[PDB]
Design a binder for these strands. Sequence first.
RNA 1: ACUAUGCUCACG
RNA 2: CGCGGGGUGGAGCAGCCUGGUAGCUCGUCGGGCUCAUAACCCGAAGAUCGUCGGUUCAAAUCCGGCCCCCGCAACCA
RNA 3: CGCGGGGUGGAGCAGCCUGGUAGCUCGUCGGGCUCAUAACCCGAAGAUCGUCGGUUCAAAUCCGGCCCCCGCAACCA
RNA 4: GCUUGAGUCUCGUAGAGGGGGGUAGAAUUCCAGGUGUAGCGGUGAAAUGCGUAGAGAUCUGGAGGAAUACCGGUGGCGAAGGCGGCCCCCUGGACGAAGACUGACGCUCAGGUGCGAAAGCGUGGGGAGCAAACAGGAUUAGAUACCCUGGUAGUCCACGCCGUAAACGAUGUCGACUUGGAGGUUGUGCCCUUGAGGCGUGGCUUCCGGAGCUAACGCGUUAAGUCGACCGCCUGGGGAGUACGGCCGCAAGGUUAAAACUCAAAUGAAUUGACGGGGGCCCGCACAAGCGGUGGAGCAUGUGGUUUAAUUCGAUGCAACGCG
RNA 5: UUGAGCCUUGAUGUGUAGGAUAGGUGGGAGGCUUUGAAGUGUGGACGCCAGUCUGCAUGGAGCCGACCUUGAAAUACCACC
Lengths: 65, 151, 116
Amino acid sequence: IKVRENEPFDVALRRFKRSCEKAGVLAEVRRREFYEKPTTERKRAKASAVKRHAKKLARENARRT
Amino acid sequence: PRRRVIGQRKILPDPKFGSELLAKFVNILMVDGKKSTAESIVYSALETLAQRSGKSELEAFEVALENVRPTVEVKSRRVGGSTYQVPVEVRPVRRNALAMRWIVEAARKRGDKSMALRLANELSDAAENKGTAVKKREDVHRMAEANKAFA
Amino acid sequence: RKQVSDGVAHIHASFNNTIVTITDRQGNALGWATAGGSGFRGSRKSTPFAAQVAAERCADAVKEYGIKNLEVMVKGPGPGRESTIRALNAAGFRITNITDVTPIPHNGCRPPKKRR
RNA sequence: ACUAUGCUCACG
RNA sequence: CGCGGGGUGGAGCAGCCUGGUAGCUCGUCGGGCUCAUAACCCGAAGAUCGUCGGUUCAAAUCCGGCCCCCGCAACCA
RNA sequence: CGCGGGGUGGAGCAGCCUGGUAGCUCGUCGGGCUCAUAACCCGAAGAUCGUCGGUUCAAAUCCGGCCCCCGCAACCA
RNA sequence: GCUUGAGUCUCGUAGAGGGGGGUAGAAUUCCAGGUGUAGCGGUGAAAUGCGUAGAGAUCUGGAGGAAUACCGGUGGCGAAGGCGGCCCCCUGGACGAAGACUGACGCUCAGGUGCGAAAGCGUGGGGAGCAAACAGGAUUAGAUACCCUGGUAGUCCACGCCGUAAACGAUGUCGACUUGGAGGUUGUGCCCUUGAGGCGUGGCUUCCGGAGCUAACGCGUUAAGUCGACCGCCUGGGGAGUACGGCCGCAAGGUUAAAACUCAAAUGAAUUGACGGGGGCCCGCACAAGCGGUGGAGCAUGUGGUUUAAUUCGAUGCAACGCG
RNA sequence: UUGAGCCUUGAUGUGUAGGAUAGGUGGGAGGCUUUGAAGUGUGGACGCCAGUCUGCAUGGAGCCGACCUUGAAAUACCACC
Ligand SMILES: [K+]
Ligand SMILES: [Mg+2]
Ligand SMILES: [Mg+2]
Ligand SMILES: [Mg+2]
Ligand SMILES: [Mg+2]
Ligand SMILES: [Mg+2]
Ligand SMILES: [Mg+2]
Ligand SMILES: [Mg+2]
Ligand SMILES: [Mg+2]
Ligand SMILES: [Mg+2]
Ligand SMILES: [Mg+2]
Ligand SMILES: [Mg+2]
Ligand SMILES: [Mg+2]
Ligand SMILES: [Mg+2]
Ligand SMILES: [Mg+2]
Ligand SMILES: [Mg+2]
Ligand SMILES: [Mg+2]
Ligand SMILES: [Mg+2]
Ligand SMILES: [Mg+2]
Ligand SMILES: [Mg+2]
Ligand SMILES: [Mg+2]
Ligand SMILES: [Mg+2]
Ligand SMILES: [Mg+2]
Ligand SMILES: [Mg+2]
Ligand SMILES: [Mg+2]
Ligand SMILES: [Mg+2]
Ligand SMILES: [Mg+2]
Ligand SMILES: [Mg+2]
Ligand SMILES: [Mg+2]
Ligand SMILES: [Mg+2]
Ligand SMILES: [Mg+2]
Ligand SMILES: [Mg+2]
Ligand SMILES: [Mg+2]
Ligand SMILES: [Mg+2]
Ligand SMILES: [Mg+2]
Ligand SMILES: [Mg+2]
Ligand SMILES: [Mg+2]
Ligand SMILES: [Mg+2]
Ligand SMILES: [Mg+2]
Ligand SMILES: [Mg+2]
Ligand SMILES: [Mg+2]
Ligand SMILES: [Mg+2]
Ligand SMILES: [Mg+2]
Ligand SMILES: [Mg+2]
Ligand SMILES: [Mg+2]
Ligand SMILES: [Mg+2]
Ligand SMILES: [Mg+2]
Ligand SMILES: [Mg+2]
Ligand SMILES: [Mg+2]
Ligand SMILES: [Mg+2]
Ligand SMILES: [Mg+2]
Ligand SMILES: [Mg+2]
Ligand SMILES: [Mg+2]
Ligand SMILES: [Mg+2]
Ligand SMILES: [Mg+2]
Ligand SMILES: [Mg+2]
Ligand SMILES: [Mg+2]
Ligand SMILES: [Mg+2]
Ligand SMILES: [Mg+2]
Ligand SMILES: [Mg+2]
Ligand SMILES: [Mg+2]
Ligand SMILES: [Mg+2]
Ligand SMILES: [Mg+2]
Ligand SMILES: [Mg+2]
Ligand SMILES: [Mg+2]
Ligand SMILES: [Mg+2]
Ligand SMILES: [Mg+2]
Ligand SMILES: [Mg+2]
Ligand SMILES: [Mg+2]
Ligand SMILES: [Mg+2]
Ligand SMILES: [Mg+2]
Ligand SMILES: [Mg+2]
Ligand SMILES: [Mg+2]
Ligand SMILES: [Mg+2]
Ligand SMILES: [Mg+2]
Ligand SMILES: [Mg+2]
Ligand SMILES: [Mg+2]
Ligand SMILES: [Mg+2]
Ligand SMILES: [Mg+2]
Ligand SMILES: [Mg+2]
Ligand SMILES: [Mg+2]
Ligand SMILES: [Mg+2]
Ligand SMILES: [Mg+2]
Ligand SMILES: [Mg+2]
Ligand SMILES: [Mg+2]
Ligand SMILES: [Mg+2]
Ligand SMILES: [Mg+2]
Ligand SMILES: [Mg+2]
Ligand SMILES: [Mg+2]
Ligand SMILES: [Mg+2]
Ligand SMILES: [Mg+2]
Ligand SMILES: [Mg+2]
Ligand SMILES: [Mg+2]
Ligand SMILES: [Mg+2]
Ligand SMILES: [Mg+2]
Ligand SMILES: [Mg+2]
Ligand SMILES: [Mg+2]
Ligand SMILES: [Mg+2]
Ligand SMILES: [Mg+2]
Ligand SMILES: [Mg+2]
Ligand SMILES: [Mg+2]
Ligand SMILES: [Mg+2]
Ligand SMILES: [Mg+2]
Ligand SMILES: [Mg+2]
Ligand SMILES: [Mg+2]
Ligand SMILES: [Mg+2]
Ligand SMILES: [Mg+2]
Ligand SMILES: [Mg+2]
Ligand SMILES: [Mg+2]
């Protein structure tokens, strides 16, 4: 998070923030995640992941493109 | 047109001032397809303008049209849901055409006597920017400057 | 009068506002501005440019103190901050370092209920 | 952003 | 009984002690906006200082009245 | 019977106790919008003020009677 | 008798299993204190609310409560309910390794009894945040809602009660048996640890699929396959998991559990359409970008209406109304 | 840490005419300069950013009052505010 970038540079470049937190504090602990809803919304985000990964093996179809 | 990107028709130069800028000005000034009446008014106006201003016609019309020319105009776009005022850089073809229409629109009102007199006075007031046409650009700027927040 | 060398530009960027507040080294307020204080009200107040102009308005009104270089301390999310720091360069400062003070609670207090 | 309703029965 | 402050467009305000340049916010009509409505934004229409008098280069402004507006706390036929 | 207060477009309220001025919100009629109805938008009409008399230059508004209407009182034995 | 089921010991392995006690850091609210100058807050847009008594922001020092970021996963443990900071205390089970021992000690279970989320209930603590009820501002025809600002019971704790949930894999428990692949997780063997490996074989687990089954959807060695043991339950939809009595509860209510009456259906899965303020991709004066109009006037025409002895008849959203 | 008065002293105070970031009024025409000067290097005090004000010195002893623009004349000396 603590980013100095030497001296001649300036131009922000603080992906250190964007690839660490921000979303963790904000879109999660902004408004209440009703205990069960995480368990629901994760398990569908988890089931959607393996749906794509299992399809990615069977994606090699005829195509003809 | 939805996905029909086609170009525009070519226009013709005006005999006595062989050009293009004021040739379109005649078309915007025209009503009921009477180009003979309209073209006689534009020559009458620019000849009376050139006498007073002490310049030519093309350069007298230019130092007048640029003073009523919009830099940025205000559209409104609903990207997400809500309706807010998004300013946008006007295209160079529409830029001068939007100015010509404001000169003629102001000249409909302001009933002096003749159409040739009214345009001459509007273009004279445009040269020293104090007409109704410059006011209509001035307000168009104020919307873009005030609502500059929106990209 | 005082004439501080360096300071700290605290930026409180919420969704609705962007409150810029330039302080000294020891967290002592010298001046401030807001998106609401700049003009820009309602829908206009929550934008990157309305934060830019607020930082430009906070850049001046601390010229008596004469800060050459400062540290940024962004906070919250907001439409500003990735825009507000651009404003501090263009105004007339040197950014020593940029930091976050976005208060991450380690699952502590129950937040408000979801809205519909 | 929000934004109601559709009187009864009738296609062997 | 007083000494004191206070007096502007329809109205609530300041500005009024530091004489040469009457602001500012609701009532005001036209826009731009959008298939539209709300909003939001831009510019317009109105007091030469409640009113009358002295001086001095210039007076809402310095000084005297009025119509008053009161703040009050005094008020024992 | 005493005592205040009332009675105003179709409804409920201002304007009434300071004499010349009739508003507000719904509803009604007309036109829009919609496939149509509602909602919504834009126009329009609609009350001589309980009634009968005064006073007055002029009365919804002042005064008197009479007809409904509320509120208060009809107590000590 | 026997030893294969079942149990014991032996040495370990993993784990938010449990119960009791500590302590840590971030943050929220608040408390006094410094700085400092108009807003903050919020929203689709506003307002209530909070602020010139000096808020918000910023920093200093406290106080208190509750919950434990990241690790963290189609990870683990638990009979289910459920169980996440770190540390000790007591403590239940699970699995593996190879033996030794017991010698059918087993499996199910009506009544019985225990445990059993959240919300409730009782007595006594605590009370930051959140938040039923409630209040105010919006929204709207109305808004006893959704949105906003406040906000009490409650959520926390100790101890008793309650005994229910879509308490759900909507799938009772135990056991045997029948093609596969990719993984996750925790063991334990064989080998060179010769270098993040080579090769088996036990637990538990997620995903896809074969035969077979199924009304179909799907299930599929963790079966909804093939069989056995025992239990629970079902018999059309409404009436109704209601009434009445019994039992249980402080109550809230739970549990057991009908009948009259009424209907010819109610229902499940899947199919084709149509529709969606579902998604994606396209189109047309659909919109944008323009331009001229109608709506205002007069007149012409055509309908509606109304009038009349008759104002013949037909056409009436778009697709009837200078139409037949 | 105060809440003001108050004297010494020093500036400060740009409608417009305009060489002047001049408030009213006045003793009245030489002050001052070698009691080490004009111009400036540089930096401070002030600033309605027009241009005031001044530490010290390389420099070296000059600078200038009526005149012309004003409702007013020059902080050249100096009295009172
Ligand atoms: K419970
Ligand atoms: Mg859960
Ligand atoms: Mg086309
Ligand atoms: Mg209805
Ligand atoms: Mg129906
Ligand atoms: Mg129907
Ligand atoms: Mg006083
Ligand atoms: Mg259209
Ligand atoms: Mg008396
Ligand atoms: Mg009326
Ligand atoms: Mg109507
Ligand atoms: Mg009547
Ligand atoms: Mg008379
Ligand atoms: Mg009258
Ligand atoms: Mg044996
Ligand atoms: Mg066993
Ligand atoms: Mg080991
Ligand atoms: Mg453990
Ligand atoms: Mg343990
Ligand atoms: Mg444990
Ligand atoms: Mg424990
Ligand atoms: Mg405990
Ligand atoms: Mg702490
Ligand atoms: Mg703390
Ligand atoms: Mg104190
Ligand atoms: Mg305090
Ligand atoms: Mg307000
Ligand atoms: Mg308020
Ligand atoms: Mg205030
Ligand atoms: Mg207060
Ligand atoms: Mg204070
Ligand atoms: Mg404070
Ligand atoms: Mg604070
Ligand atoms: Mg603290
Ligand atoms: Mg503590
Ligand atoms: Mg397990
Ligand atoms: Mg189980
Ligand atoms: Mg213990
Ligand atoms: Mg067990
Ligand atoms: Mg055991
Ligand atoms: Mg063994
Ligand atoms: Mg035996
Ligand atoms: Mg034996
Ligand atoms: Mg049993
Ligand atoms: Mg039983
Ligand atoms: Mg129990
Ligand atoms: Mg329990
Ligand atoms: Mg219990
Ligand atoms: Mg509970
Ligand atoms: Mg309790
Ligand atoms: Mg009680
Ligand atoms: Mg008690
Ligand atoms: Mg509390
Ligand atoms: Mg709350
Ligand atoms: Mg709430
Ligand atoms: Mg309520
Ligand atoms: Mg209130
Ligand atoms: Mg409410
Ligand atoms: Mg309401
Ligand atoms: Mg709150
Ligand atoms: Mg706890
Ligand atoms: Mg405890
Ligand atoms: Mg305990
Ligand atoms: Mg019990
Ligand atoms: Mg039970
Ligand atoms: Mg049940
Ligand atoms: Mg469950
Ligand atoms: Mg589940
Ligand atoms: Mg499964
Ligand atoms: Mg069940
Ligand atoms: Mg059992
Ligand atoms: Mg085993
Ligand atoms: Mg199959
Ligand atoms: Mg079968
Ligand atoms: Mg099949
Ligand atoms: Mg299965
Ligand atoms: Mg098998
Ligand atoms: Mg097998
Ligand atoms: Mg097995
Ligand atoms: Mg089995
Ligand atoms: Mg089976
Ligand atoms: Mg079956
Ligand atoms: Mg039966
Ligand atoms: Mg039945
Ligand atoms: Mg039946
Ligand atoms: Mg019952
Ligand atoms: Mg009993
Ligand atoms: Mg009992
Ligand atoms: Mg109870
Ligand atoms: Mg039963
Ligand atoms: Mg029926
Ligand atoms: Mg069913
Ligand atoms: Mg179905
Ligand atoms: Mg659709
Ligand atoms: Mg669609
Ligand atoms: Mg076409
Ligand atoms: Mg269009
Ligand atoms: Mg047009
Ligand atoms: Mg038109
Ligand atoms: Mg019409
Ligand atoms: Mg017409
Ligand atoms: Mg008409
Ligand atoms: Mg004719
Ligand atoms: Mg007819
Ligand atoms: Mg007749
Ligand atoms: Mg006809
Ligand atoms: Mg007909
Ligand atoms: Mg017909
Ligand atoms: Mg037809």
